[PDB]
Amino acid sequence: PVDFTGYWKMLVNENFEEYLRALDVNVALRKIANLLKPDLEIVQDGDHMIIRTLSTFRNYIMDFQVGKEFEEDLTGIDDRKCMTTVSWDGDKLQCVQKGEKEGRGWTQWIEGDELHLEMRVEGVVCKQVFKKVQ
Ligand code: NA
């Protein structure tokens, strides 16, 4: 179906403060996190994906098989651990992160030449949109 491989630059980042607050991130980290505009670097081969969130502060790496639950170490974000599953929902990717926080997960898809990422926790929705540099 869809190949997310690319270096994706952030265009839109809505409600990130609210999202981090819901994860109990301290204000000092939130202050700096919001000015950050992390890139997304994705390499995919079939059901195998590495998704790197790249910033000047901290990087976050997700390295998984679609459909295979794994222990996700959210070191650098809220430093929690989740039981995480990323699933194919047609061409969309749906991630559920089971753990402390209810309703934690995200949805990722491509519309035209933009990558959309919706991250959720406890009913907060953060909306991100990315584009490659042509
Ligand atoms: Na790996």
UniProtKB/Swiss-Prot annotation:
Signal peptide: none annotated. Coiled coil: none annotated. It comes from the Eukaryota. Its main location: cytoplasm. Transmembrane segments: none annotated. Keywords: Cytoplasm, Lipid droplet, Methylation, Retinol-binding, Transport, Vitamin A. The keyword Lipid biosynthesis does not apply. Changing residue 21 to A: No effect on retinol binding. Abolishes interaction with STA6 and the ability to enhance STA6-mediated vitamin A uptake. CDD domains: CRBP1 (cd19462). The keyword Transport applies. Interacts (only as retinol-free apoprotein) with STRA6. Belongs to the calycin superfamily. Fatty-acid binding protein (FABP) family. Cytoplasmic retinol-binding protein. Accepts retinol from the transport protein STRA6, and thereby contributes to retinol uptake, storage and retinoid homeostasis. This is Retinol-binding protein 1.
